[PDB]
């Protein structure tokens, strides 16, 4: 049922300092956090898709929200 | 169903006012819940137009004290307006208490287990407590005088724990001293009450005969708005909250402010010696004022320690601030409320604090650890005032909810509620011998209530606007009373607890007039704070806002 | 993107040499994932680029706040008094252990009072919950959420 | 003005007798720039269900969509009574008698040599 | 260290805000002014931001000089991701 593996995390850190250790409360809050971003970013795109009268999800829905809501701008 | 809840409402409301009035006047009580859990059940099923024409219809036989809620409840009018309140999303849940007597309940029960009204009855067993006394119905200034509350006038088998609200040192009502653990008595500690009782030599029995003097401390410019002040129980510190998110210490005694010296200065010095705090005093910053910065907001509470270092201060930035006295920095920033703390205060020990917030709960802090001890949370609404007992084993946090809660320390239990002010209580203060409880709010009441009994003592209702401001005095001769009509109200706090039930109430006597001994006007000044000298003098303190 | 200059572009482009100056979700439980939040709306399929779009978009929102994290985990690791173009401005901590050394004299003197009555009877980087508390409360998601709220106590 | 006096009729339904002239102003300020986030958002969302009107359903998504980040609120009733029996369930800890100025762990505190530049 | 030098050429310089107003709004926010010069980098840091917005309002205004009205605040922050909004209720 988890989606963040927690190894996979560690390299997102390593990538950015190659020297440092997070703390497994500061690990564990992380992942919730993560949990949480995709639990609201599908609820407020499968929102856009009943408005676009679908039943698909394509990422048009996904790519809407976080350019009005988040700001990321992920190349699609 | 919901086409027709102003048939339900208006047959109920046709059989209450057709009663005898002995049982009218008590029947009257649920006009407002079944009028507020009809309304909110409307506009959670999405019946807007309906909700709005039950509003019109029913909103002005609503009781005058309710106005503040009813507007609230005339905004809403959709569901996601109020999935976003949390103080209506807490009132559709819980239960109005109810309180009535077992003489009116059968005219009650009488007129709702028939099928003529089984719709109307249905909200009553859903939404309602009743809360039945054996007694005589109470008149209708007595209902008055203790309801007011969302989810209000609360049960009595709240208010039947056991509550130590005697001092330390027998008194069986006293706690023990290691039921709280509460800190050491230090030997300059123990050198403060040594001189505490020099001044309890020359205090005066104040009574109704000899009225205290009041000496006004006065804010002259306070372009920045005053928010907080508090003094010291040895009246030789005046500390002020400002809207420019400053705290400034003012000497009141011909003694400058000064700081310690720096660390270079107090390693080349000697321990050991009798002089030592003199020793070590920095002469080269000596001031009558110290500003201290550091809050990003404007300062709402204010708060000295008995030993008179550790000023404590909280804002509108969710931060409580310990501020040292001897360095006059800053020491540590205690995060727990992301929203306003509206008061803080310090245990009269000194070890633990209070802080209430707009997060609807009141920490309990203990100068130790980051995170609290204690969350005091069982308010609807914003926790306005937190209050320590002269034991410290009990916090009492008024609220804007209209409710008075007593917090036990142990446990975190809410051990009496008190409920009968019309709007959020701004000010609480004990007695001195701890059996006693006053509070103010907006509507200018000041309500005495018994702790042992959990019951309303009495009521003084001279003050026109909100009542910010209370003390008792050193004896407990005399409650003072500050408001913002610009008065010092004196109340004989002697002769309104003369008297010491399973009705769960007392005749409240109506005397207001025989237990006012003055009434004083400020100069266009609002009084925000009022303190007691230990020689019993009267200290106050509020901005000159000439408006 | 949308912006040219835009100011958060200078943000994480200033940042990144701020700590050089000192996810890839899985795609399997991912997909049941989004299928089940789907079935309160009646999204009942989902397009096969977006499970591995949303891992996409997690990752750039976890590096956008693991970076954030890691450049106030490395402000506490910049020692003032290695260098001399600072100076020492006030010690409040000196001045409190001067003050527990004269409190552990009175604690002497209450023990040689006690006795009397005897007789006559490669710097390493590591990130807190103070870190990342620090990066919740500022940006304008996440700063009043239940999920702060519950990290000021854990 | 139009707007400005159904402004003093909003505060004077809410009991705010007094008020700065200022308020008024900046209220309309934020009036308008609620509905010009709103809208839009509206049109921003019914180019993605390709339709050349903005109808109700767009200024509906638009507005619970802006409300679902913009306004929120304190934590609810349950999710505070939850956190206070999880922590009123741990004892108070004792005291040591002579620990001295009572403080959390330094790194909770502001106590540091707090540093200044060398003038020069 | 080109700005600590900067920092420490700040004493003898004095910038367009005055540092009893920089003070003012720092002192409301908690930051006290321990040292002039930080207050004099954080006035300068300011300036800087207000006038780089109104050079770029002013290229927009050259491209439609003078007069600066709100349709050359409006593309010339559009570029910053500030959308600026008109009274247009007075």
Redesign the interface.
Known sequence: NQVLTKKKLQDLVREVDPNEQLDEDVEEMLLQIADDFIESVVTAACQLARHRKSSTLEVKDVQLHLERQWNMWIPG | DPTMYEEYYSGLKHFIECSLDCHRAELSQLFYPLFVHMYLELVYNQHENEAKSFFEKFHGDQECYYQDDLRVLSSLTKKEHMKGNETMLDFRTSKFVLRISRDSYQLLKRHLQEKQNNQIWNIVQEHLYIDIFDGMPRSKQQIDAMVGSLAGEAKREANKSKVFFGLLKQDPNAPPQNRIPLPELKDSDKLDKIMNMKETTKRVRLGPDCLPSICFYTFLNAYQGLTAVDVTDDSSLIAGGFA???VRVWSVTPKKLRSVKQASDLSLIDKESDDVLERIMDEKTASELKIL????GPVYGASFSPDRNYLLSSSEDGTVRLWSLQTFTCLVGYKGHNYPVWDTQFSPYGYYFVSGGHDRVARLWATDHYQPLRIFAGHLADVNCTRFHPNSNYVATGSADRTVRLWDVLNGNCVRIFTGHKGPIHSLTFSPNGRFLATGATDGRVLLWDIGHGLMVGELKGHTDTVCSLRFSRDGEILASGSMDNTVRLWDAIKAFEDLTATGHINLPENSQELLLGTYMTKSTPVVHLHFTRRNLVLAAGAYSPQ | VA??????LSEESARILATNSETFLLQAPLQRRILEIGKKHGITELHPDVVSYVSHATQQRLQNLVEKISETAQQKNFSYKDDD?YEQ?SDVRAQLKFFEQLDQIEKQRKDEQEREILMRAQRITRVNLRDLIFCLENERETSHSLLLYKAFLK | ?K??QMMAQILKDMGITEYEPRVI?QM??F???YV??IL?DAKIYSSHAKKATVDADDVRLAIQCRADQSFTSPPPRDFLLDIARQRNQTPLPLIKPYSGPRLPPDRYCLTAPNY??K?? | ?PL?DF??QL?DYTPTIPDAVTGYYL??????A??P?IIRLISLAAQKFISDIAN?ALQHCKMKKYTLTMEDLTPAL????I?V??????
């Open positions: 420019d998110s400053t910065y550091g809050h990003s | 912006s040219m200059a835009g100011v958060n173009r401005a | 003005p707007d400005a102003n309309l300020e009036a308008f720039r010009t986030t839009d200044r530049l003038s020069l | 260290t600590v920092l420490m004493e002192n409301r926010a908690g930051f006290e321990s040292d010069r770029d559009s570029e910053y991701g959308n909004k008109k009274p247009h209720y007075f």
